[PDB]
């Protein structure tokens, strides 16, 4: 920018998307990263490994493709997050992947958040990922009970499109039930 002497940050630091200091500590494990990223409407989970020209995604799952298994609910919440993780975790098992380290990117390690939910899902799918149970949200909030009780303070419907009035954390149970099933076209 200024002159020849000037120092321009690495592209992904310039873009404010990659924390290289945390990335190194991450890579040091030797295991693949369970990249847990989230958007306003959706949630993504990738099983990434290292490669000669860049990272390699062996398995992955996006909350959008969750509906492909019968998801008529939103996609930026807790049950959504967990399930996306479990889906990704399952596809990972199939690809030969057996262990990984949670990479939450620039997200915060806040207790009970969606990234830990994503992590709980992948682990449940059979993946060995270094975790801490008391930083994970309790089973009920993962189901989405926190939102059903929010809809209890009704007077006005929480959901615009008709998924239902009172909402169904049981839909979560239905989907999880569907994924753990040995069949399922991954």
């Amino acid at each position: 920018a200024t002159g020849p002497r000037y120092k321009v940050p690495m592209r992904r630091r310039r873009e404010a998307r990659t924390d290289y200091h945390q990335r190194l500590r991450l890579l040091k494990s030797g295991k693949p990263r369970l990249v847990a990223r989230k958007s306003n409407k959706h949630v993504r989970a990738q099983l990434v490994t290292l490669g000669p020209n860049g990272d390699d995604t062996l398995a992955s799952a996006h909350s959008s493709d969750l509906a492909e298994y019968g998801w008529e609910a939103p996609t930026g919440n807790m049950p959504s997050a967990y399930l996306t993780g479990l889906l990704a975790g399952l596809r990972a098992q199939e690809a030969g992947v057996e262990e990984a380290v949670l990479d939450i990117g620039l997200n915060s390690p806040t207790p009970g958040s969606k990234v830990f939910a994503i992590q709980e899902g992948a682990i449940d799918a059979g993946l060995d990922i270094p975790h801490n149970d008391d930083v994970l949200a309790d089973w009920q909030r993962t189901r989405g009970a926190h939102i059903a009780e929010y809809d209890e303070q009704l007077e006005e419907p929480l959901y615009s499109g008709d998924f239902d009035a009172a909402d169904l954390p049981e839909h979560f149970d239905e989907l999880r039930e569907t994924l753990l099933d040995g069949d399922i076209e991954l």
Binding site: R5, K7, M10, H21, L27
Partner: peptide, 12 residues
């Protein structure tokens, strides 16, 4: 000067 700052993790 241009190589200043933290190095890329890849080679480490």
């Amino acid at each position: 000067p241009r190589d200043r700052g933290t190095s890329p993790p890849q080679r480490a």
